[PDB]
Amino acid sequence: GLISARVDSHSKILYARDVDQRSTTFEKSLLMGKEFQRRAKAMMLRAAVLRNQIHVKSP
Amino acid sequence: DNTIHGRIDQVNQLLELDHQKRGGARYTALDKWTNQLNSLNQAVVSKLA
Amino acid sequence: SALEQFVNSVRQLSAQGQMTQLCELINKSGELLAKNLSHLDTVLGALDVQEHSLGVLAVLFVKFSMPSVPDFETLFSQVQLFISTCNGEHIRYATDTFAGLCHQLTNALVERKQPLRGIGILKQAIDKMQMNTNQLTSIHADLCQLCLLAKCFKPALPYLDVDMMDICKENGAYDAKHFLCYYYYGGMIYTGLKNFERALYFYEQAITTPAMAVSHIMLESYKKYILVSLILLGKVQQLPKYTSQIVGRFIKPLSNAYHELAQVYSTNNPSELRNLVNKHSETFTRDNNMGLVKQCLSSLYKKNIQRLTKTFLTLSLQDMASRVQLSGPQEAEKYVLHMIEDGEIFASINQKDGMVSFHDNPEKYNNPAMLHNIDQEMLKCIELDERLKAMDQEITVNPQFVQK
Amino acid sequence: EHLIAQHSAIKMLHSRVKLILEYVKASEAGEVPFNHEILREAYALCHCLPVLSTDKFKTDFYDQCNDVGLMAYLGTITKTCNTMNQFVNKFNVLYDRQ
Amino acid sequence: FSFKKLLDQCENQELEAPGGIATPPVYGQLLALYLLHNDMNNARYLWKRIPPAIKSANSELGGIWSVGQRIWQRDFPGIYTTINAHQWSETVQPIMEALRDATRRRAFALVSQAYTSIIADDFAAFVGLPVEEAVKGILEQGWQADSTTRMVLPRKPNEQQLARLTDYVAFLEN
Amino acid sequence: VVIDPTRTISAGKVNLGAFRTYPKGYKPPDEGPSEYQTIPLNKIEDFGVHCKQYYALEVSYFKSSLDRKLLELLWNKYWVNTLSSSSLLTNADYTTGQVFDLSEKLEQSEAQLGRGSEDKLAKATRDSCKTTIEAIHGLMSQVIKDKLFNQINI
């Protein structure tokens, strides 16, 4: 839900958590780049197999 | 009531007012660009079949 | 002597061009009924190295039973010597008998139960058949099968770390069997070496092969893909959009126990997960993927401990080993220590108070190391785009791509 | 163009610093009357380098470098997506039977 | 340096082989080198493919796999009490000594990076040495310690820049 | 005359255009070079609709003899500002706006790809290339300044 906080069960205190935008955006952008590269490689292989006409026949 | 911009620290019995402003617009724009790039890349890849 | 005529014709055709006629003559077979092929084999290896003899060797091996007398060792040495010293792109003019001979050798080695002599053979039998290092050949499947039957997973890493981009037509043949076998055995090797990030990719590549019938390879590749996804991530990753419709009608109902396991691995309950695991123990051991489901069970506790960092800042060890059901402060402490050592979590342990503090503040992006990482990512993307454009221009200048 | 502008300015700086070094070397070897004010000012100028070698400055500089690097990464990804779309279009036109 | 080349040579010698089977000294050297480099999966698979005849003929492979199992369980006292149980003649002794030093260094780094208050007995068990000299020697390294509670407090420790930018600009503008 | 004081700072060259319109009802005969200009989404319809009713004259600049002498005398003291520019800080809101506009254009291009003027992906790519090239220029200027000044450790 809407609470953005972290509990401390030693002293029993709830601390508000402030998220820095810079690190979060850097992390998400790098993850998106990794996913994009993986998808591009996979579809390059898919294009190769489609061009070469590889498929599974009944026998 | 959004008349005082700050937050209370109960443990130390004080209140801290937000006076520092950072450039979050740049990071919001970068987030939007990243999301749009992700969607566009997925669509372009899915075009080939 | 017809054999003498054939050898003389090979000699004249060699070092003279006329490669189409040479291939036609070598394809003119069936007259090699005589079993004295050894002396005719050992007369022309010196001249024009070894662009020939592939024919005689395949004929020596095709016998399918008791091939080359108690001289099977001599036949094997002949094969390995030919593969090592043949050299040249000459043999590429007949690059289907080469793959056939390699298949026969691999089958013979598997039957003989010594799948380590050939690992060095179908490693030199690849660089002299493929045009470039980014081309998949039918010998990749044989090499993966050999180095998986023998537990030597390191030789295949150079041939698995490459991103295949062209597939050899092999002058006909090259059914989908070799493609599925390579992209499944590579995933199995990576799973054995605990590289799930690429085992998942290989299994997905095997799954998304265009098919219209159910194959035994794709079944026990979907089954392992589910488990590797459950280990690497917390959920079963969604299959690509261009996957064939066959998998959504037969493979999914055939693989049911794994889907129940995935469903149970969505409400975090290690007791229920273990109950399902040992209820379907017969199925999970008949499918032979036992020891991976145990990895899923062990990974559930680590996933729960990692989730504990999204809410808590400092947690008592005894209290923490009551939400993850670890049954012991010492067990929880050892779990946290292992997770910190492996780099999965960012936390510290305090033995005086018996409390684990979660930091989850690794780094700020202001380092030359991060600059170098981003530079490497950009270099990889630039190379990807350059290859895309290079293979696009070939289609552009294609005469068939001028009428439309 | 960008580099040409920067080049012109750096060229002016080089000229000036070289003339100052020559005067200083000529004064040291002995060719012109010994001037104390000019030599003291040259020492003060030489003591002003490096400029701002502090940790806060280094952190700010690396912040800027990494920000521009991420922007370049996103631009490269966009360009690669465009090239990919063109290749997919051409492949679909060529290898499809309609 | 001196071990990476030996590992590569042993790997190549095993791969070539006089028919798949390598000599037991090479098998032992390869297993201990895999243990030294913390390639636990490679060592686990190497032990699995060792022929049972070689296992029965040579008993030192049993002890080497005992060390490997102790490393696999991440049981430092087991590693230290199992390393000092057998020996050979110059074939595995230097590499086992290097393995002991590597285990000591790894234990030190792990204790430093994943602990803020550790009982002195547990720290001695992790490092390997008995309590007295370990508690004596932590202070000279800067680690706080205090008696009557034995709670050690570990402490946590180019002209081509223009070329890359020009390459990026030339690629983007094309 | 239309000026762009923000793009002038961003690109390092003045953005000045001199135009003259056509009489009512006159249809100019083709001859449209139409060099590419990046224009935001909220101002693209007007540019598209009103584009053939005016033409751009060829603009050149001139100066007098005293002006030339004074400028060549002034450069000897004005060369400092080129080496102490730091263009990456003065233009940040502009870059943020450009990124926002580019993201919107990318969304429109993806919508066109999903659906069934021409090839908006190419226009979005050109816009992204322009913005990124400007940013990299701003960074390499600072790299040059650092190499010149911060490394000459006495």
XYZ file of N, CA and C in Angstrom, chain E:
522
model
N 49.069 -17.173 -11.483
C 50.312 -17.084 -12.239
C 50.935 -18.466 -12.410
N 51.597 -18.947 -11.356
C 52.228 -20.260 -11.411
C 51.215 -21.393 -11.331
N 49.985 -21.109 -10.902
C 48.946 -22.126 -10.808
C 47.981 -22.118 -11.984
N 47.722 -20.955 -12.586
C 46.823 -20.901 -13.735
C 47.400 -21.683 -14.911
N 48.694 -21.502 -15.187
C 49.326 -22.242 -16.274
C 49.338 -23.738 -15.997
N 49.591 -24.134 -14.749
C 49.552 -25.550 -14.399
C 48.150 -26.117 -14.584
N 47.126 -25.352 -14.200
C 45.751 -25.797 -14.392
C 45.431 -25.978 -15.868
N 45.846 -25.024 -16.703
C 45.606 -25.146 -18.139
C 46.333 -26.353 -18.718
N 47.582 -26.570 -18.300
C 48.343 -27.713 -18.795
C 47.692 -29.028 -18.389
N 47.246 -29.130 -17.136
C 46.584 -30.350 -16.686
C 45.267 -30.567 -17.419
N 44.511 -29.492 -17.654
C 43.259 -29.608 -18.394
C 43.506 -30.117 -19.807
N 44.513 -29.559 -20.486
C 44.824 -30.005 -21.840
C 45.307 -31.449 -21.852
N 46.136 -31.828 -20.876
C 46.627 -33.201 -20.814
C 45.488 -34.183 -20.577
N 44.530 -33.816 -19.726
C 43.363 -34.666 -19.523
C 42.511 -34.741 -20.783
N 42.359 -33.616 -21.487
C 41.520 -33.598 -22.681
C 42.101 -34.471 -23.785
N 43.408 -34.358 -24.031
C 44.032 -35.179 -25.062
C 43.928 -36.653 -24.697
N 44.630 -37.059 -23.633
C 44.544 -38.371 -22.997
C 44.935 -39.523 -23.920
N 45.437 -40.631 -23.367
C 45.639 -41.861 -24.145
C 44.382 -42.721 -24.239
N 43.251 -42.084 -24.532
C 41.994 -42.798 -24.635
C 40.960 -42.367 -23.616
N 41.101 -41.154 -23.091
C 40.135 -40.623 -22.152
C 40.592 -40.669 -20.709
N 41.389 -41.675 -20.364
C 41.850 -41.873 -18.995
C 43.206 -41.205 -18.829
N 43.327 -40.358 -17.813
C 44.581 -39.696 -17.488
C 45.208 -40.331 -16.251
N 46.490 -40.038 -16.049
C 47.217 -40.621 -14.936
C 46.699 -40.063 -13.608
N 46.712 -40.873 -12.552
C 46.171 -40.432 -11.252
C 46.853 -39.185 -10.708
N 48.173 -39.010 -10.882
C 48.767 -37.733 -10.447
C 48.136 -36.515 -11.097
N 47.828 -36.592 -12.393
C 47.187 -35.467 -13.068
C 45.777 -35.260 -12.532
N 45.066 -36.351 -12.244
C 43.728 -36.243 -11.673
C 43.763 -35.531 -10.326
N 44.701 -35.921 -9.461
C 44.814 -35.274 -8.164
C 45.208 -33.814 -8.271
N 46.168 -33.506 -9.147
C 46.563 -32.116 -9.341
C 45.394 -31.279 -9.840
N 44.622 -31.812 -10.788
C 43.483 -31.076 -11.326
C 42.416 -30.851 -10.266
N 42.112 -31.879 -9.469
C 41.108 -31.720 -8.422
C 41.539 -30.680 -7.397
N 42.800 -30.732 -6.966
C 43.259 -29.774 -5.969
C 43.347 -28.366 -6.549
N 43.652 -28.243 -7.844
C 43.661 -26.927 -8.474
C 42.253 -26.359 -8.589
N 41.267 -27.215 -8.865
C 39.881 -26.759 -8.869
C 39.454 -26.315 -7.478
N 39.872 -27.053 -6.447
C 39.576 -26.639 -5.078
C 40.226 -25.301 -4.753
N 41.468 -25.099 -5.200
C 42.180 -23.860 -4.903
C 41.475 -22.654 -5.509
N 41.000 -22.779 -6.746
C 40.412 -21.653 -7.460
C 38.944 -21.437 -7.126
N 38.393 -22.204 -6.186
C 37.002 -22.098 -5.750
C 36.016 -22.441 -6.860
N 36.462 -23.173 -7.881
C 35.566 -23.686 -8.918
C 34.927 -24.974 -8.403
N 33.942 -24.796 -7.523
C 33.360 -25.945 -6.836
C 32.568 -26.829 -7.789
N 31.867 -26.230 -8.753
C 31.119 -27.030 -9.717
C 32.053 -27.876 -10.572
N 33.159 -27.287 -11.026
C 34.114 -28.033 -11.839
C 34.714 -29.192 -11.057
N 35.076 -28.961 -9.793
C 35.618 -30.039 -8.971
C 34.575 -31.119 -8.719
N 33.328 -30.715 -8.471
C 32.262 -31.680 -8.236
C 32.053 -32.571 -9.451
N 32.111 -31.993 -10.651
C 31.935 -32.801 -11.853
C 33.175 -33.632 -12.153
N 34.362 -33.111 -11.834
C 35.588 -33.876 -12.040
C 35.610 -35.123 -11.170
N 35.182 -35.003 -9.912
C 35.117 -36.186 -9.061
C 34.098 -37.186 -9.587
N 33.006 -36.695 -10.176
C 31.951 -37.590 -10.641
C 32.417 -38.442 -11.815
N 33.260 -37.886 -12.681
C 33.701 -38.587 -13.879
C 34.991 -39.371 -13.680
N 35.585 -39.325 -12.496
C 36.776 -40.139 -12.227
C 36.377 -41.611 -12.215
N 37.067 -42.477 -12.952
C 36.696 -43.897 -12.977
C 36.835 -44.518 -11.600
N 35.944 -45.445 -11.240
C 36.045 -46.077 -9.914
C 37.342 -46.834 -9.701
N 37.948 -47.360 -10.768
C 39.224 -48.053 -10.626
C 40.309 -47.111 -10.120
N 40.355 -45.888 -10.651
C 41.328 -44.911 -10.173
C 41.011 -44.498 -8.741
N 39.723 -44.420 -8.396
C 39.342 -44.094 -7.025
C 39.835 -45.153 -6.048
N 39.699 -46.430 -6.412
C 40.124 -47.500 -5.517
C 41.640 -47.649 -5.488
N 42.312 -47.417 -6.618
C 43.759 -47.608 -6.675
C 44.487 -46.594 -5.802
N 44.093 -45.328 -5.881
C 44.734 -44.256 -5.135
C 43.796 -43.769 -4.041
N 44.289 -43.748 -2.804
C 43.485 -43.327 -1.666
C 43.557 -41.831 -1.396
N 44.521 -41.125 -1.992
C 44.638 -39.692 -1.749
C 43.489 -38.916 -2.380
N 42.870 -39.471 -3.423
C 41.691 -38.832 -3.993
C 40.553 -38.777 -2.984
N 40.452 -39.780 -2.108
C 39.453 -39.727 -1.052
C 39.661 -38.552 -0.115
N 40.906 -38.328 0.309
C 41.187 -37.187 1.167
C 40.987 -35.861 0.459
N 41.365 -35.793 -0.818
C 41.163 -34.567 -1.580
C 39.675 -34.258 -1.698
N 38.855 -35.285 -1.932
C 37.417 -35.056 -1.976
C 36.850 -34.753 -0.597
N 37.494 -35.227 0.470
C 37.085 -34.815 1.810
C 37.284 -33.315 1.995
N 38.439 -32.804 1.563
C 38.668 -31.359 1.599
C 37.630 -30.640 0.747
N 37.341 -31.185 -0.435
C 36.358 -30.563 -1.307
C 34.973 -30.515 -0.693
N 34.572 -31.592 -0.018
C 33.270 -31.620 0.638
C 33.215 -30.626 1.790
N 34.310 -30.505 2.546
C 34.349 -29.514 3.616
C 34.225 -28.101 3.061
N 34.846 -27.836 1.910
C 34.694 -26.524 1.283
C 33.269 -26.333 0.774
N 32.670 -27.389 0.220
C 31.311 -27.295 -0.307
C 30.311 -26.974 0.793
N 30.468 -27.592 1.964
C 29.577 -27.307 3.081
C 29.832 -25.943 3.709
N 30.880 -25.237 3.281
C 31.262 -23.944 3.850
C 31.513 -24.063 5.350
N 32.241 -25.107 5.726
C 32.555 -25.418 7.117
C 34.053 -25.177 7.287
N 34.410 -23.981 7.757
C 35.823 -23.622 7.885
C 36.584 -24.512 8.862
N 36.090 -24.796 10.075
C 36.817 -25.746 10.933
C 37.009 -27.103 10.282
N 36.026 -27.568 9.511
C 36.202 -28.811 8.781
C 37.318 -28.731 7.758
N 37.386 -27.619 7.022
C 38.462 -27.433 6.051
C 39.812 -27.487 6.748
N 39.941 -26.766 7.862
C 41.235 -26.676 8.529
C 41.632 -27.989 9.191
N 40.667 -28.743 9.721
C 40.977 -30.018 10.350
C 41.096 -31.162 9.354
N 40.665 -30.971 8.108
C 40.783 -32.008 7.093
C 41.987 -31.803 6.183
N 42.413 -30.553 5.973
C 43.639 -30.304 5.218
C 44.832 -30.945 5.915
N 44.921 -30.792 7.235
C 46.035 -31.340 8.010
C 45.712 -32.754 8.499
N 45.526 -33.653 7.534
C 45.324 -35.068 7.820
C 46.132 -36.003 6.933
N 46.582 -35.562 5.761
C 47.350 -36.394 4.844
C 48.440 -35.540 4.209
N 49.217 -36.152 3.316
C 50.268 -35.434 2.608
C 50.729 -36.255 1.412
N 51.421 -35.582 0.494
C 52.096 -36.229 -0.626
C 53.475 -35.593 -0.770
N 54.152 -35.896 -1.874
C 55.532 -35.473 -2.102
C 55.571 -34.492 -3.272
N 55.365 -33.209 -2.962
C 55.640 -32.090 -3.861
C 54.623 -32.012 -4.998
N 53.752 -33.014 -5.113
C 52.738 -32.973 -6.160
C 51.582 -32.055 -5.781
N 51.114 -32.137 -4.536
C 49.967 -31.369 -4.074
C 50.283 -30.502 -2.866
N 51.463 -30.647 -2.263
C 51.768 -29.880 -1.055
C 51.780 -28.372 -1.281
N 52.491 -27.820 -2.274
C 52.457 -26.356 -2.442
C 51.069 -25.817 -2.728
N 50.286 -26.531 -3.538
C 48.951 -26.053 -3.871
C 48.007 -26.187 -2.681
N 48.186 -27.204 -1.835
C 47.378 -27.271 -0.618
C 47.754 -26.164 0.359
N 49.040 -25.816 0.436
C 49.433 -24.677 1.261
C 48.816 -23.385 0.737
N 48.827 -23.202 -0.586
C 48.189 -22.029 -1.173
C 46.690 -22.030 -0.904
N 46.066 -23.210 -0.928
C 44.648 -23.314 -0.601
C 44.386 -22.909 0.843
N 45.254 -23.328 1.765
C 45.101 -22.932 3.163
C 45.214 -21.420 3.317
N 46.201 -20.817 2.652
C 46.348 -19.366 2.724
C 45.135 -18.658 2.129
N 44.619 -19.169 1.010
C 43.444 -18.568 0.390
C 42.226 -18.679 1.293
N 42.055 -19.824 1.956
C 40.944 -19.981 2.889
C 41.068 -19.009 4.054
N 42.285 -18.825 4.571
C 42.495 -17.859 5.645
C 42.127 -16.448 5.199
N 42.596 -16.048 4.015
C 42.306 -14.705 3.521
C 40.813 -14.516 3.274
N 40.156 -15.533 2.712
C 38.722 -15.453 2.463
C 37.941 -15.349 3.765
N 38.338 -16.115 4.785
C 37.670 -16.022 6.078
C 37.844 -14.638 6.685
N 39.052 -14.078 6.592
C 39.280 -12.730 7.104
C 38.386 -11.718 6.399
N 38.328 -11.785 5.066
C 37.513 -10.834 4.315
C 36.031 -10.993 4.633
N 35.558 -12.236 4.740
C 34.150 -12.473 5.042
C 33.784 -11.954 6.425
N 34.626 -12.224 7.426
C 34.358 -11.725 8.771
C 34.364 -10.204 8.780
N 35.290 -9.593 8.041
C 35.344 -8.136 7.997
C 34.101 -7.547 7.342
N 33.582 -8.195 6.297
C 32.514 -7.594 5.508
C 31.109 -7.969 5.961
N 30.944 -9.008 6.776
C 29.605 -9.464 7.134
C 29.462 -9.647 8.634
N 30.084 -8.773 9.420
C 29.973 -8.857 10.870
C 30.335 -7.513 11.480
N 29.633 -7.150 12.554
C 29.971 -5.979 13.348
C 30.247 -6.304 14.807
N 29.905 -7.505 15.266
C 30.208 -7.942 16.626
C 30.245 -9.459 16.619
N 31.430 -10.040 16.784
C 31.603 -11.484 16.693
C 32.303 -11.983 17.949
N 31.773 -13.056 18.540
C 32.415 -13.661 19.699
C 33.807 -14.143 19.314
N 34.764 -13.972 20.230
C 36.158 -14.276 19.916
C 36.349 -15.746 19.563
N 35.616 -16.642 20.228
C 35.717 -18.060 19.893
C 35.247 -18.326 18.467
N 34.134 -17.709 18.065
C 33.638 -17.893 16.705
C 34.606 -17.319 15.679
N 35.203 -16.164 15.978
C 36.184 -15.586 15.064
C 37.413 -16.477 14.940
N 37.870 -17.047 16.057
C 38.999 -17.968 16.005
C 38.662 -19.207 15.189
N 37.445 -19.732 15.347
C 37.030 -20.882 14.549
C 36.979 -20.537 13.066
N 36.471 -19.350 12.731
C 36.409 -18.929 11.334
C 37.803 -18.806 10.736
N 38.702 -18.110 11.434
C 40.041 -17.879 10.904
C 40.829 -19.182 10.852
N 40.733 -19.991 11.902
C 41.419 -21.267 11.942
C 42.390 -21.389 13.097
N 43.106 -20.308 13.391
C 44.014 -20.304 14.524
C 43.223 -20.340 15.830
N 43.812 -20.867 16.902
C 43.141 -20.818 18.205
C 43.021 -19.388 18.712
N 42.272 -19.248 19.808
C 41.732 -17.945 20.189
C 42.842 -16.954 20.518
N 43.832 -17.375 21.307
C 44.719 -16.416 21.965
C 45.473 -15.556 20.956
N 46.151 -16.183 19.994
C 46.955 -15.398 19.065
C 46.089 -14.610 18.089
N 44.901 -15.111 17.750
C 44.014 -14.347 16.874
C 43.549 -13.062 17.551
N 43.137 -13.158 18.819
C 42.748 -11.953 19.548
C 43.958 -11.063 19.801
N 45.150 -11.650 19.918
C 46.342 -10.822 20.061
C 46.651 -10.061 18.775
N 46.433 -10.687 17.623
C 46.818 -10.106 16.354
C 45.768 -9.272 15.651
N 44.522 -9.286 16.126
C 43.535 -8.415 15.489
C 43.830 -6.945 15.781
N 44.286 -6.631 16.998
C 44.484 -5.231 17.379
C 45.544 -4.550 16.522
N 46.641 -5.247 16.215
C 47.653 -4.650 15.352
C 47.129 -4.395 13.946
N 46.012 -5.015 13.571
C 45.362 -4.744 12.298
C 44.315 -3.641 12.390
N 44.019 -3.145 13.590
C 43.053 -2.083 13.771
C 41.671 -2.521 14.207
N 41.488 -3.793 14.557
C 40.184 -4.306 14.968
C 40.037 -4.154 16.477
N 38.978 -3.474 16.910
C 38.732 -3.310 18.335
C 38.356 -4.640 18.975
N 38.854 -4.864 20.188
C 38.505 -6.031 20.979
C 38.457 -5.616 22.442
N 37.724 -6.383 23.245
C 37.601 -6.064 24.659
C 37.411 -7.353 25.442
N 38.094 -7.439 26.580
C 38.072 -8.621 27.424
C 36.820 -8.619 28.299
N 36.608 -9.738 28.994
C 35.479 -10.047 29.873
C 34.164 -10.171 29.113
N 34.149 -9.889 27.811
C 33.003 -10.172 26.955
C 33.399 -10.800 25.631
N 34.680 -10.768 25.261
C 35.230 -11.353 24.035
C 34.317 -11.114 22.832
N 34.118 -9.835 22.526
C 33.291 -9.406 21.400
C 34.150 -8.551 20.475
N 34.790 -9.203 19.500
C 35.593 -8.487 18.520
C 34.679 -7.657 17.631
N 35.127 -6.446 17.291
C 34.360 -5.523 16.461
C 35.074 -5.343 15.128
N 34.779 -6.166 14.122
C 35.421 -5.990 12.817
C 35.057 -4.654 12.190
N 35.993 -4.112 11.418
C 35.820 -2.834 10.746
C 35.829 -3.041 9.236
N 34.895 -2.389 8.553
C 34.720 -2.598 7.120
C 35.694 -1.726 6.336
N 36.519 -2.311 5.455
C 37.487 -1.562 4.648
C 36.821 -0.682 3.595
N 45.434 9.092 -19.694
C 44.214 8.715 -20.396
C 43.785 9.802 -21.375
N 44.312 9.733 -22.595
C 43.972 10.674 -23.652
C 42.850 10.173 -24.553
N 42.247 9.029 -24.233
C 41.250 8.400 -25.089
C 39.820 8.683 -24.641
N 39.625 9.624 -23.716
C 38.267 10.031 -23.372
C 37.611 10.779 -24.523
N 38.389 11.570 -25.262
C 37.846 12.252 -26.433
C 37.554 11.270 -27.558
N 38.350 10.202 -27.664
C 38.149 9.236 -28.738
C 36.799 8.543 -28.621
N 36.428 8.122 -27.411
C 35.148 7.447 -27.224
C 33.979 8.379 -27.518
N 34.061 9.628 -27.056
C 32.987 10.580 -27.315
C 32.863 10.877 -28.803
N 33.995 11.019 -29.494
C 33.956 11.230 -30.936
C 33.358 10.026 -31.649
N 33.681 8.816 -31.186
C 33.075 7.620 -31.761
C 31.564 7.627 -31.573
N 31.101 7.995 -30.377
C 29.664 8.026 -30.114
C 28.970 9.043 -31.010
N 29.557 10.234 -31.143
C 28.954 11.268 -31.981
C 28.938 10.837 -33.441
N 30.033 10.236 -33.915
C 30.095 9.793 -35.302
C 29.089 8.684 -35.575
N 28.845 7.816 -34.591
C 27.835 6.782 -34.783
C 26.434 7.377 -34.801
N 26.129 8.257 -33.844
C 24.781 8.814 -33.759
C 24.448 9.656 -34.982
N 25.358 10.543 -35.382
C 25.124 11.373 -36.556
C 25.219 10.558 -37.841
N 26.050 9.519 -37.838
C 26.303 8.675 -39.006
C 26.831 9.495 -40.173
